[PDB]
Amino acid sequence: GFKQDIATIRGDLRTYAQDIFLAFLNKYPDERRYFKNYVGKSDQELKSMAKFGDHTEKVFNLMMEVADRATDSVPLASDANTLVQMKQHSSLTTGNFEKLFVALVEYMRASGQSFDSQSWDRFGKNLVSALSSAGMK
Amino acid sequence: GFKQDIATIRGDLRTYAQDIFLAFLNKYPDERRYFKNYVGKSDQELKSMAKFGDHTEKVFNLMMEVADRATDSVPLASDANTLVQMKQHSSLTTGNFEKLFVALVEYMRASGQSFDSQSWDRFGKNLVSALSSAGMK
Ligand code: HEM
Ligand code: HEM
Ligand SMILES: [N+]
Ligand SMILES: [N+]
Known part of the structure; x- marks a missing residue:
């Protein structure tokens, strides 16, 4: 179930983080504009840029912490607040987050x-709802 | 994204080249008049002609190079020049190129x-605009 999934992803965080993040950018190419250093780079090209590995690592580590602190897939109000208040997310709306999770779920369904x-x-x-409760537009 | 698409196509070039070119010819059967020995043949008959596979491969090899040399999907002027000046392309207009790209985009949307x-x-x-600047009618 969900808890085991967190263990699956954590076990090979680099591979899953990079896979899912790329699934996200490839499914929703207009999202790439938020990551100006990734513009004009193939999947394999990104995988040798230090910032790409570091970014995806940090993102999915945090996502797993939020996931782990959730109850029955409902995230904590404080965790939603952390995500909204991050300077890096100031220009985002909940639509950005929906897109990420649609891509993530499609990835999981397609996986072996x-x-x-x-x-x-x-x-x-639930995270989208919590991000709204926490003031993201 | 676009850069990744270049890798995807290059990773199965012969197959994508023939399939996209066939989409082009089937969408616009009168374009066959610029080629030789294509009329009156099904997809499978075309794919068994040695010259057909070789032509499509050479076209898509070069097309992927032009894509790869582009910045933000804007091709190099010199690449546009080369395409205009090729003897094989002497009787073309930019309309021929726009049709090829309409078919290619349609193929990509329909694909899994x-x-x-x-x-x-x-x-x-951008290629059409560049071909126009290079002097193609
Ligand atoms: C639950 C989902 C998300 C989590 C856990 C998360 C987490 C993070 C973390 C930890 C960082 C800082 C990483 C570092 O300092 O290296 C970051 C940065 C960033 N995030 Fe998110 N993020 C999420 C969703 C999104 C979405 C959906 C977008 C927009 C499509 C986005 C856009 C950005 C941008 C543009 C940065 C700055 C990256 C840079 O400057 O290189 N995030 N995020
Ligand atoms: C970016 C798009 C295109 C690329 C990269 C491209 C590239 C090429 C290449 C590499 C060749 C082989 C020349 C040789 O063997 O030295 C060729 C031949 C040719 N191309 Fe294109 N081409 C493009 C668009 C078009 C279009 C739109 C048409 C017509 C609708 C066309 C018509 C032809 C013809 C008639 C030949 C000669 C075929 C023959 O041997 O009978 N090309 N092209
Ligand atoms: N990946
Ligand atoms: N195909």
Whole structure:
């Protein structure tokens, strides 16, 4: 289930973080503009840029912490607040986050690795609701 | 994105080249008049002609190079010049090129693969503008 999925992802965080992040940018190419250093780079090209590995690592580490602190795929109000208040997310709306989770769920469904994809969909919806409660437009 | 799409196509070049070129010819069957020995043949008959596979490969090899040398899907002027000045292209107008890119973009949208179709549309439009600047009618 969801908790095991967190263990799956954490076990090979670099690979899953990079895979899912690329799935996100490739599914929603207009999202790439937020990451100006990734413009004009193929998947394999990004995988040798230090910042790309570091960014995806840090993002998915945090996402897993929020996931782990959730109850029944409902994230904590304080965690939603952390995500809204981050300077790096100041220009974002909840639509950006929906897109990420749609891509993430599609990735999991397409994987050969078992995942509780429905629970990640639910988590994404609940996080979107929490981001709104916390003041993201 | 666009840069990744170049890798995707190069990773199965012969197959994508023939499939995209066939989409082009089937969408615009009167374009066959610029070629030799294509009329009156099905997709499979075309794919069994040695010259067909070799032509499509050479076209797509070069097209991917032009894409790869571009910045933000804007091709180099010298690449546009080369395409205009090729003896094989002497009787073409930019309309021929726009049709090829309409078919290519349509192919990408219809595919099961995550292409950045809008960036290929821009690339086609930018190529046409560049071909015009290079003197193609
Ligand atoms: C739950 C989902 C998300 C989490 C946990 C998360 C987490 C993070 C973290 C930890 C950083 C800082 C990383 C570092 O300092 O290296 C960061 C930066 C950033 N995030 Fe997010 N993020 C999420 C969703 C999104 C979405 C959906 C977008 C926009 C499409 C986005 C856009 C950005 C941008 C542009 C930066 C700055 C990166 C840079 O300057 O190189 N984030 N995020
Ligand atoms: C960016 C788009 C295009 C690229 C990269 C491209 C590239 C090429 C290349 C590499 C060749 C082979 C020349 C040689 O063997 O030395 C070729 C030949 C040719 N191309 Fe293109 N081409 C493009 C668009 C077009 C279009 C739109 C048409 C017509 C609708 C066209 C018509 C032809 C013809 C008629 C030949 C000669 C074929 C023959 O041997 O009978 N090309 N092209
Ligand atoms: N990946
Ligand atoms: N195809």
